[PDB]
Design a protein around this ligand. Sequence first.
Ligand SMILES: Nc1ncnc2c1ncn2[C@@H]1O[C@H](COP(=O)([O-])OC(=O)C[NH3+])[C@@H](O)[C@H]1O
Length: 442
Amino acid sequence: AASSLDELVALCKRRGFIFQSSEIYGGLQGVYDYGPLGVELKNNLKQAWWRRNVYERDDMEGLDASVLTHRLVLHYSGHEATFADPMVDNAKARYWTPPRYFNMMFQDLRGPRGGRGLLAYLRPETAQGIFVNFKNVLDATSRKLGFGIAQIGKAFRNEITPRNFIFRVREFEQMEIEYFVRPGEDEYWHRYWVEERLKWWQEMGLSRENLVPYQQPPESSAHYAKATVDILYRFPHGSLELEGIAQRTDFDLGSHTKDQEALGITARVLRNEHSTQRLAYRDPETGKWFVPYVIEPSAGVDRGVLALLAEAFTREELPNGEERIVLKLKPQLAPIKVAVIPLVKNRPEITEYAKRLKARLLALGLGRVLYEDTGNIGKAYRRHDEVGTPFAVTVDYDTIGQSKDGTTRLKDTVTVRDRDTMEQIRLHVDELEGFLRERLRW
Ligand SMILES: Nc1ncnc2c1ncn2[C@@H]1O[C@H](COP(=O)([O-])OC(=O)C[NH3+])[C@@H](O)[C@H]1O
């Protein structure tokens, strides 16, 4: 584990993981930019989640709706209502500083002028994009009930207060699922998904010891959610929310469908005077139109990253030197898998061999390979553990052929230094393939 968020924040900048957004002009607090190594890690997390919840499954369809949301969507979603109370602050008390309707959803206008007619919010959550497209998806796929639609996407929130690095921010991405289910089964499903999502975060690298499901109680059970379970993580600042396996119940489709009344809505949904379409399902064997309940697993992509980094940032002491900080990311999720390093930057015959090898290895398809050509190998080696790349293959003279001893047997064999054990095997190129194949493969 990583001792203090500070370190994390500092490694993140010093290595190009996360940079402060708009830093040169003062920075837009609450919004960050993912530098080079950040992107990679971030994408890999996104990818693996997609593989898991979509490719490997057989009851999920994917989606990717837009950030701009038509004013009504967020209205019937109830999101509007949450800020229709102005706050007339005062000296020692609260809701006299002027009436501030403290809306958390960002706001923008559609062309021409700032009229209430052409208003649109930036989706505070990806979720809505799925509910409104429910029929559309159902039509094009023609899915039978035990099934859900899932997307990764941007989400903007005017967070009055952004706190703790890349945790609570104003702009972030979420990986959301909306498991549509027959009314009765909701209980199981909710259980199933919580267990699943916890199972996942573990294979991703988060130790079970730090993961904790927590039944939000009535007080905290937000409107749509009939129940909800968070999976908190023991971050370096605390045991906070990581993913939230909720259990809204036909409320979403209910607040968004035509004929709410005719439809047996069980949720206290607004009178939807708008929807152009009946967002409901039709036949189990009878032909009873009904509105599906949903289990919704929402993860924060950015926090998933905070977790993974916090969890992996270890700073062991060297049994010789002082100490080293070592990101020990699940190899398969490291920004770089293998980093090929030329021993002397001079010898062009060496470097060429190096650049050449990088190719051969990238080809295995175990992940990104890097031709690190930066100065001091001691420096290269370190840089790497700091960014947690699993294997550092280094090429010296002997590899190419030359040597002092006049030996060419060392040729085509390279030294592969392992991150965690810092152990240095010296294996022949052809073996290097098989070797990595065993480790970096999922
Ligand atoms: N400002 C923010 N920054 C980062 N992640 C955030 C966030 N606000 C919410 N999340 C993520 O959204 C997840 C779900 O909580 P939520 O309050 O976003 O609810 C919903 O998205 C309901 N669909 C959390 O587990 C968290 O990872």
